[PDB]
Amino acid sequence: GREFGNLTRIRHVISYSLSPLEQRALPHVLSKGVPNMLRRVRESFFRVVPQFVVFYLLYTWGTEEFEKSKRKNPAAYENDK
Amino acid sequence: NVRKLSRADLTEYLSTHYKAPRMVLAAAGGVEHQQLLDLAQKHLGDIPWTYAEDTMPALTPCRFTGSEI
């Protein structure tokens, strides 16, 4: 079936490659890779983060409320006698 | 390049590369050697030999790369 002899039909594309032993494995990290990671974080920040911030607010609120609910109310004894 | 090469380039090429100590006159067949040598002195002996200014171009040394096209 699917085999490297007849996958698709292409015309007029040229490629060039070096061998691994001719070139470096980690050529430019701090001059190219770091800024690229930075933009890659920039492009997705506001699509992911705010939902989790909202989750954090909800969690803390619900915890606080549950913990208030367990403390004794002075009006339950002071009001009528 | 062929749409842009000039007569100056052609004549410079010849003047810089076509020098006697880079040339061989060879013959095979029914040819006698001394006759060929006489004719060579008569018709080829005025070709110059003084490389001038080392006008010959500088060029890159050899290297082989494992690669694909």
UniProtKB/TrEMBL annotation, chain A:
GO biological process, alphabetically ordered: cerebellar Purkinje cell layer development; hippocampus development; hypothalamus development; midbrain development; mitochondrial electron transport, ubiquinol to cytochrome c; pons development; pyramidal neuron development; subthalamus development
Family: Belongs to the UQCRQ/QCR8 family.
Entry-linked InterPro entries: Cyt_bc1_su8 (IPR004205), Cyt_bc1_su8_sf (IPR036642)
Subunit structure, as described in the record: Component of the ubiquinol-cytochrome c oxidoreductase (cytochrome b-c1 complex, complex III, CIII), a multisubunit enzyme composed of 11 subunits. The complex is composed of 3 respiratory subunits cytochrome b, cytochrome c1 and Rieske protein UQCRFS1, 2 core protein subunits UQCRC1/QCR1 and UQCRC2/QCR2, and 6 low-molecular weight protein subunits UQCRH/QCR6, UQCRB/QCR7, UQCRQ/QCR8, UQCR10/QCR9, UQCR11/QCR10 and subunit 9, the cleavage product of Rieske protein UQCRFS1.
Gene3D superfamilies linked to this entry: Cytochrome b-c1 complex subunit 8 (1.20.5.210)
Organism: Chlorocebus sabaeus (Green monkey)
One Pfam short name: UcrQ
Subcellular location: Mitochondrion inner membrane
Domain of life: Eukaryota
Keyword Transport (UniProt): yes
Protein name in the entry: Cytochrome b-c1 complex subunit 8
Keywords: Electron transport, Membrane, Mitochondrion, Mitochondrion inner membrane, Respiratory chain, Transmembrane, Transmembrane helix, Transport
Keyword Hydrolase tagged: no
One Gene Ontology cellular component: respiratory chain complex III
Topological category with respect to the lipid bilayer: Single-pass membrane protein
Gene: UQCRQ
Task performed by this protein: Component of the ubiquinol-cytochrome c oxidoreductase, a multisubunit transmembrane complex that is part of the mitochondrial electron transport chain which drives oxidative phosphorylation. The complex plays an important role in the uptake of multiple carbon sources present in different host niches.
